[PDB]
Ligand binder design. Structure first.
Ligand code: IPT
Ligand code: IPT
Ligand code: MG
Ligand code: MG
Ligand code: MG
Ligand code: NA
Ligand code: NA
Ligand code: NA
Ligand code: NA
Lengths: 1015, 211, 174
C-alpha cells in the first residue's frame, strides 16, 4: 500500500491524516501557568536519543522495522540532520536543483532515514482526551507508524506536521517509526539557495488535549487615530461536543496586572443565510492607553484563553504574547503605529556550522543580540517559516519579521513553470495557509511573504488575495516576476541598485530611485535582498542608506545575508576547518556562494558588520562651527539611555574630551554647543569624534555599548617648518650591477637590472626578502570573481577582464634607472613598463630621494593605458624580513576598510596585533586593508604619506592560489602592500561587476608619495 | 459546467453563457464552513481551474461564476483572483455571502426585489434599484436568479423589466429556471406520470420544489 | 489498497493519475477535417452497451470483478444514471444534504456502481502515440481499472476526467 502509492511523487498528496495547523498550543490545565509562559505537563518533548537507520531508497526498508528495532541502527540525537552525523553527503547547490528536473518524479535512489523511538506513555493521557504528536520539522517528507500501525504522511519541511495518536497508543511502552525521504515532490518547492539536507531536524513532541478543546484562536488589535485607544479582538474556535455550559474567557495582562477580561458562551454572529459559527466566539476587550509594541520598545501583553464551564471549572487554557501595533501601507508608505518605518533588515537562514539546520535557543538569542547590537531592527525568514521559538524571541527582543512561505522553485525554466501551473496550487496553498495559521498571532511578524524566487504565476495572485482576505493586518510581499507584480503590496527587488538601471528583459532591476516614480507606481520600496555580503563586500553600502534617508518611499531593505553557511569538517590531525560547497564530494555545486554572511558561522563579525552598524545608526549628526546637531531617527522612543561622548584629537593625540547626556525626542533634534576648544601649537589635523554610548545595560546590550559615531575634520594647521639641516650626507656607491646608498650603518641597494630596491640594510641585518616592486593586481575578491568558473568562463567579471588583459602575468621591463648625488641627498630615478603581448599596460615613473636624516622619499607617477581594464590597485609591495607582534598606524580603523566601505572606520592612532591585520575569509582574497593612512609603524619601520595598506604573513599570490583559509601557511617575514590607490570592492551583487565608476581607477594618470625611514 | 456540446451550440445559435464552477455547499452551517476552510481550497480550486481550462475558448461564455450558494469564503477570494489573473477577458461573478462581496465583479443577487428591501442580517437582499446606489457601490447588477417560476408564478415579472429598461446599471437577470425537474414514473396501467421529491421513497425530500 | 485508502473520504485526494484539463480535443490527422469540424478517426465514442452491477457498498464488490464480467450483471446503456434504470432511488433534496453532514466522511452504505465494457482497440493505436480515455461526466467519484490493472481515481461530477491508457491496453479485446 505505502510502497504502491508513492505519495512522495504526487503534488496532489502533501499530507495524509495530518491535523489542522494552528497557533502554538500547550494545553495548560492551570491559568496561572499559562499567564506566565511556564512549562506545561501536557506538552512533552520527545527530543533526545532516538534509533536511526539509513537506506539508499525506501524500497530497501525491511518490513520488520515497523514492529522491531533494527540491531544495526545506531543511536543518535533528535532533532538532527542525518548528513551531520555522516550517513550521506550534504549538497550545496544554489539555483540548479540537486535532483533531475522531472516533476513530480524524484530519483529512484532516494536516501531514507528510518527513525524510531521507544517511549513511555502515561495512563492518564489515554483514559481521556486526545494525544497528538507534533513534528516541527521533517525534511522533506515522511510516513509515520505508531506501534506497527500506519498513522499518516506529511510534506513541507518547514512547518509542524501533527497527527492524532489517541487510537494508536497503549499504556506503558510504545514505538514510533518515522520513515523520512530526502526527496519528495515537495522538494520542487524547496529549492532555496542553501545546503540540501534532510531528517527530523526540529523538535518532536507530544501534546495532550481534552476532547473538548481550543482548536484555534486569532488575536487582533485595532486602534483609534492617535493610538490612545485599542480594541483587542480574539476569535476562539473549539472542537468537541458543544454544550450550553461551555464558556471562553479571554483576559489580557501587563505583567501581573489584569488590564481587561471578558467572558462569553459559544456561538458567533450570523455570517450568512445558514446562520453563524456555533463552534466559535469572539471576545472584544477595550484597552485604554495601550503600551505599543515596536522593535524600539517591545511592549508586550499576555492574552490568556480559558476554555471552561460556567461553574468555574477550567477545561484547558492556551495563551500568547500580544504586541499592540498597527501595520498599514498608506499613501505609499509602510507605517507602523502611524509612523513610517525605516527597515534596517537582514536575511537570516537557519544555519549552525555543527548541527546544520537544527536550531537551538542559544544560537537564536546570540543572533538577535548581535543584530540589535549592530542596529538591525528587522529580519526576513529567508526562505521558509522558522523554528517557532524564533518568533517568540523577535516578539520579546524587538525585531520586525517577514514570514516567508516555504516555496522556492528557482531551478524551473521558466521560474514560474510550477507557480503558474494550477495543478501545483494545492501544494503551494498549504505552504502559505499553514504558515499564516501558525504564525498570525505574533506581533513581530509585520509582513507576509509568498515565498522566494519562483517567478510570478497565477498561484501567487490567488494566494496573495487569500492572505489579504484572511489577515488584513499585514502587508503581503513577493519579489518574484519582477518585484512589482500584482502579487506584492511592496516593491521588493533583490540587488536593485541605487542609481544604476539594470534593464533585464521582462524583469528589469531599475534603480530604486527611478523605480519609485515609474508612471503609475505608488507603492513603498523595501529591498527584500540587497548588499550581497559575500566575502570582502558591502562596497557602496553607504550609497543605499543615503538614498533610504533622502527618499520617503525608500524604506530600506534586508541585507543578504546574516550568517555564512560554512560547515565544520576535520583534517587528518582532527583539527577543524570551515567547509563550503564541494567539500563533501557534492556535485554539481556552487562552491562558496553559500557564504554571504555578515558573521562567520561561529558568529564572529566580518569587517562589513561594523559598516552596517554605522549606516544603520539611529542618530544622525551635523557639525556647524561649534554646534553639534543630533537628530534621532527613532519613531517612538526618547533617547533615555544615551549620552554623547566627544573627543578632539590632533593626529591621534587627545586634546579635549567630554560628555553631554542626549535628550532627543523621536524624530527630534538636540543642539550641543562645544566648549571653546584649546588651540594646539603643533602642526596637523584636528579631528572631532562623537560616540553615542548607552550607559545602562538592556536586554540586548551591556552597559557602555556604543550605538553610533561620527567624525569631522576641524582646524588644520599645515607644517611650514623646515626640518633641521642634517649633518650626515649619504654616499652613492655606483656599481655595474647596483646603486648603493650608505648612511652610517644604513644601506640601500638598488638593482640596476630590474630597477627596484632589492635590499636594505641596518648594520648586518637585511630588511627585505623580496624587492620593492609596483603592484597593479589583487587576490581577486568574490565580487571580482562572480559566477565565473573554469568550466564556464564569464569574460565580463573583473578577474577575467584582468586575466585576459595580462594584469597577472605582466612582466616589468626597465626603461630608465639613473642615480644622482644632490647637495645633501642621493636621487634614484627609475622608469618601468608592464607589458603583455606588445601592449604597454602601466608605466611607473619613480624618484627615490635619500637624505642625511636617513629618510627615503619615494615619489611614484603611474600611467594606465585607457583601453586596459581599470586596475585593482596602484601601489607597491615587498616582503619584509622582520616579524613584529604589533602594527601601529595613523589612519582609518581599527577594522579592515576599503574605499567604498570606509565610512564606519575612524581616523585615529591604532595599535593591533599583526593577526588582526588579516581577515580570515573562508575563501582567501585581498583583505585587511586600511585606507587614508598617513603613518604606518611596523617594527623598526615607519612609512608616511597618504595611502592605503594591508600587512600580513600572506602574499597576494598565496591568497589567490589557495582555495580555503585553513590551507594557508604563514610565509617567512611580513608581506606589505602599500597602495596610493585601491579599487572599490563592490557587492551590490556578487555575479556581475558592481564597483561604481567613482571607485574604479579610471584617471589614466596617478600620483602618490611615500617616505620610508627607521624610527 | 455543462455537457461540452452545450457551449458549441450556444456559440453557434447565439446565447450569452455564465459558466459556473461545480461548487455548491448550501447545506453547511454556516454556508461558508467549507469555502472558508483552507483545507478545502485544493478541492475547490480544481473545480474552478479545470472549468476555465476546458471552456475558455468558447465565445458564448462571457462571464465566469465561482459556484453557487456556498456563502463567502476566503477560498472564493483566492479563486476570484486566480480567474481574473488567468483570463482577463471575462468578468467573474459569485452571489454567495450577500451578492456584492469582493469575489464578484457583478452584483448578482438572487430573488432581490424591484422596490422592496429584504433587510436580512449579514446578507440583505436590497431592492435592486436601491442596491445600485448604496454608498461607494459602482458595479452593474444582474440577477443570477429571479422570478421563481414555480407552478403558477411570474407574478410581477413586468416590474423587473420596467426597472431593467429604466436603470442603466440594472442589466437584467436569469429567470429561475428553464425546465421542471420532474421524472417519469409508471402506474399499474403502464401510464407515464410526472413525479417529484418523495415519489421514489426518497426522504427527507423537498417535494415539488424541483419544479 | 483501494479499499484501504478510502480516497472518496479525503478532500486532499480528488484525483489520481488524471491528465491535465484542456480545451476540447479531437486530434485530427487531416487539416480539412479540422477546418470543417467533421468527425475524427482519432476520437472514438465508447457509448452504448456496457455491463453493470449494483452494490450497497464498495466493500461488497467482489475482487473477481476486476478481470471477469460478473454473471449477475445486466447489460445497460451508457451514458446513464443508474437511478433511471431502477437500481436505486433518486433523491430530491433542495438545501439539506442527502447524506449526514460529517465532512469528509460519507455513509458506510455507499451505493456503488460497477461498470464494465469489453471493447476492441486497433493495432495502430498502440504502436505509436498515446491512447487516453475521457470520462466527460461521472457522479460522484470513481476508480478506474484497465485489464485488471489499476489506472486512477477522479472526482468532480461535471468535468471530464481523462486518464492515459497507452501502457494498459492490448490489441483486440480489452
Ligand atoms: C547567481 C544569481 C543569478 S542567483 C542569486 O544567488 C545568490 C547567491 O548567494 C542569492 O541566492 C540570490 O538570492 C540569488 O538571486
Ligand atoms: C428555500 C430557500 C431558503 S433556498 C432557494 O430554494 C429554491 C427552490 O427552488 C432555489 O433552489 C434557490 O436557488 C434557493 O435560493
Ligand atoms: Mg506528494
Ligand atoms: Mg534562489
Ligand atoms: Mg477524495
Ligand atoms: Na526613507
Ligand atoms: Na547564497
Ligand atoms: Na438597463
Ligand atoms: Na428547485
Amino acid at each position: 500500500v505505502v510502497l504502491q502509492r508513492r505519495d512522495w511523487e504526487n503534488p496532489g498528496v502533501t499530507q495524509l491524516n495530518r491535523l489542522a495547523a494552528h497557533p502554538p498550543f500547550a494545553s495548560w490545565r492551570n491559568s496561572e501557568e499559562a499567564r506566565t509562559d511556564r512549562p506545561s505537563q501536557q506538552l512533552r518533548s520527545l527530543n533526545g536519543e532516538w534509533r536511526f537507520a539509513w537506506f539508499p531508497a525506501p524500497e530497501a526498508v525491511p518490513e520488520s522495522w515497523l514492529e522491531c528495532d533494527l540491531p544495526e541502527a545506531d543511536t543518535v540525537v533528535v532533532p538532527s540532520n542525518w548528513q551531520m552525523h555522516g550517513y550521506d553527503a550534504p549538497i550545496y547547490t544554489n539555483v540548479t536543483y540537486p535532483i533531475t528536473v522531472n516533476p513530480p518524479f524524484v530519483p529512484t535512489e532516494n536516501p531514507t532515514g528510518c527513525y524510531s523511538l521507544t517511549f513511555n506513555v502515561d495512563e492518564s493521557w489515554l483514559q481521556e482526551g486526545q494525544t497528538r504528536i507534533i513534528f516541527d520539522g521533517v525534511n522533506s517528507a515522511f510516513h509515520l507508524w505508531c506501534n506497527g500501525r500506519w498513522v499518516g504522511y506529511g510534506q513541507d519541511s518547514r512547518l509542524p506536521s501533527e497527527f492524532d495518536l489517541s487510537a494508536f497508543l497503549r499504556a506503558g511502552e510504545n514505538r514510533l517509526a518515522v520513515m523520512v525521504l530526502r526527496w519528495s515532490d515537495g522538494s520542487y518547492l524547496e529549492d532555496q539557495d542553501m545546503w540540501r539536507m534532510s531528517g527530523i531536524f526540529r523538535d518532536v513532541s507530544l501534546l495532550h488535549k481534552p476532547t473538548t478543546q481550543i482548536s484555534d484562536f486569532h488575536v487582533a488589535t485595532r486602534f483609534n487615530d492617535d493610538f490612545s485607544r485599542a480594541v483587542l479582538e480574539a476569535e476562539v474556535q473549539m472542537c468537541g461536543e458543544l454544550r450550553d455550559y461551555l464558556r471562553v474567557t479571554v483576559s489580557l495582562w501587563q505583567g501581573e496586572t489584569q488590564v481587561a477580561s471578558g467572558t462569553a458562551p459559544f456561538g458567533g454572529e450570523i455570517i450568512d443565510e445558514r446562520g453563524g459559527y456555533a463552534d466559535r466566539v469572539t471576545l472584544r476587550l477595550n484597552v485604554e492607553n495601550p503600551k505599543l509594541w515596536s522593535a524600539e520598545i517591545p511592549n508586550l501583553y499576555r492574552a490568556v484563553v480559558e476554555l471552561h464551564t460556567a461553574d468555574g471549572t477550567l477545561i484547558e487554557a492556551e495563551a500568547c504574547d500580544v504586541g499592540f501595533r498597527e501595520v498599514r501601507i498608506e499613501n505609499g508608505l509602510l507605517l507602523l503605529n502611524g509612523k513610517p518605518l525605516l527597515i534596517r533588515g537582514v536575511n537570516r537562514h537557519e544555519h549552525h556550522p555543527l548541527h546544520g539546520q537544527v536550531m537551538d535557543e542559544q544560537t537564536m538569542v546570540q543572533d538577535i543580540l548581535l543584530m540589535k547590537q549592530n542596529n538591525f531592527n528587522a529580519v526576513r525568514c529567508s526562505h521558509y517559516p522558522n523554528h517557532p521559538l524564533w518568533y517568540t524571541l523577535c516578539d520579546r527582543y524587538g525585531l520586525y519579521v517577514v514570514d516567508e512561505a516555504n516555496i522556492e522553485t528557482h531551478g524551473m525554466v521558466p521560474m514560474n513553470r510550477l507557480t503558474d501551473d494550477p495543478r501545483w496550487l494545492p501544494a503551494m496553498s498549504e505552504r502559505v495557509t499553514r504558515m499564516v495559521q501558525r504564525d498570525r498571532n505574533h506581533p513581530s511578524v509585520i509582513i507576509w511573504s509568498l515565498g522566494n524566487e519562483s517567478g510570478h504565476g497565477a498561484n501567487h495572485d490567488a494566494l496573495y488575495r487569500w492572505i489579504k482576505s484572511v489577515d488584513p493586518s499585514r502587508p503581503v510581499q513577493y519579489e518574484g516576476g519582477g518585484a512589482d507584480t500584482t502579487a506584492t503590496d511592496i516593491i521588493c527587488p533583490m540587488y536593485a541598485r541605487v542609481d544604476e538601471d539594470q534593464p533585464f528583459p521582462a524583469v528589469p532591476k531599475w534603480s530604486i530611485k527611478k523605480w519609485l516614480s515609474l508612471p503609475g507606481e505608488t507603492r513603498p520600496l523595501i529591498l527584500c535582498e540587497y548588499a550581497h555580503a559575500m566575502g570582502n563586500s558591502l562596497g557602496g553600502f553607504a550609497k543605499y542608506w543615503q538614498a533610504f534617508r533622502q527618499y520617503p518611499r525608500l524604506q530600506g531593505g534586508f541585507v543578504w545575508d546574516w550568517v555564512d553557511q560554512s560547515l565544520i569538517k576535520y583534517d587528518e590531525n582532527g583539527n577543524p576547518w570551515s567547509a563550503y560547497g564541494g567539500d563533501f564530494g557534492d556535485t554539481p555545486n556552487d562552491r562558496q556562494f553559500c557564504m554571504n554572511g555578515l558573521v562567520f558561522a561561529d558568529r564572529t563579525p566580518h569587517p562589513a558588520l561594523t559598516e552596517a552598524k554605522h549606516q544603520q545608526q539611529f542618530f544622525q549628526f551635523r557639525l556647524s562651527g561649534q554646534t553639534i546637531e543630533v537628530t534621532s531617527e527613532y519613531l517612538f522612543r526618547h533617547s533615555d539611555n544615551e549620552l554623547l561622548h566627544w573627543m578632539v584629537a590632533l593626529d591621534g593625540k587627545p586634546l579635549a574630551s567630554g560628555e553631554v547626556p542626549l535628550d532627543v525626542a523621536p524624530q527630534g533634534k538636540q543642539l550641543i554647543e562645544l566648549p571653546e576648544l584649546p588651540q594646539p601649537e603643533s602642526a596637523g589635523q584636528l579631528w572631532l569624534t562623537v560616540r553615542v554610548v548607552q550607559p545602562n545595560a538592556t536586554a540586548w546590550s551591556e552597559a557602555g555599548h556604543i550605538s553610533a559615531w561620527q567624525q569631522w575634520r576641524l582646524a588644520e594647521n599645515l607644517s611650514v617648518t623646515l626640518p633641521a639641516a642634517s649633518h650626515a650626507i649619504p654616499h652613492l656607491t655606483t656599481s655595474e650591477m647596483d646603486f648603493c646608498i650608505e648612511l652610517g650603518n644604513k644601506r640601500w641597494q638598488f638593482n640596476r637590472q630590474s630597477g627596484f630596491l632589492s635590499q636594505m640594510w641596518i648594520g648586518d641585518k637585511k630588511q627585505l626578502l623580496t624587492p620593492l616592486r609596483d603592484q597593479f593586481t589583487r587576490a581577486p575578491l568574490d565580487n571580482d570573481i562572480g559566477v565565473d568558473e573554469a568550466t564556464r568562463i564569464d569574460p565580463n567579471a573583473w578577474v577575467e577582464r584582468w586575466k585576459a588583459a595580462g594584469h597577472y602575468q605582466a612582466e616589468a621591463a626597465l626603461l630608465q634607472c639613473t642615480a644622482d648625488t644632490l647637495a645633501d641627498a642621493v636621487l634614484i630615478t627609475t622608469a618601468h613598463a608592464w607589458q603583455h603581448q606588445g601592449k604597454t599596460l602601466f608605466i611607473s615613473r619613480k624618484t627615490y630621494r635619500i637624505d642625511g636624516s636617513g629618510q627615503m622619499a619615494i615619489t611614484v607617477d603611474v600611467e594606465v593605458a585607457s583601453d586596459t581594464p581599470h586596475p585593482a590597485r596602484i601601489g607597491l609591495n615587498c616582503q619584509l624580513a622582520q616579524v613584529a607582534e604589533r602594527v601601529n598606524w595613523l589612519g582609518l580603523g581599527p577594522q579592515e576598510n576599503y574605499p567604498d566601505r570606509l565610512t564606519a572606520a575612524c581616523f585615529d592612532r591604532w595599535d593591533l596585533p599583526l593577526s588582526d591585520m588579516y581577515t580570515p575569509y573562508v575563501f582567501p582574497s585581498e583583505n585587511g586593508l586600511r585606507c587614508g593612512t598617513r603613518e604606518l609603524n611596523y617594527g623598526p619601520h615607519q612609512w608616511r604619506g597618504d595611502f592605503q595598506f594591508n600587512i600580513s604573513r600572506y602574499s597576494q599570490q598565496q591568497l589567490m592560489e589557495t582555495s580555503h583559509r585553513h590551507l594557508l601557511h604563514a610565509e617567512e617575514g611580513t608581506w606589505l602592500n602599500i597602495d596610493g590607490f585601491h579599487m572599490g570592492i563592490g557587492g551590490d551583487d556578487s555575479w556581475s561587476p558592481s564597483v561604481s565608476a567613482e571607485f574604479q581607477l579610471s584617471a589614466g594618470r596617478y600620483h602618490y608619495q611615500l617616505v620610508w625611514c627607521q624610527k
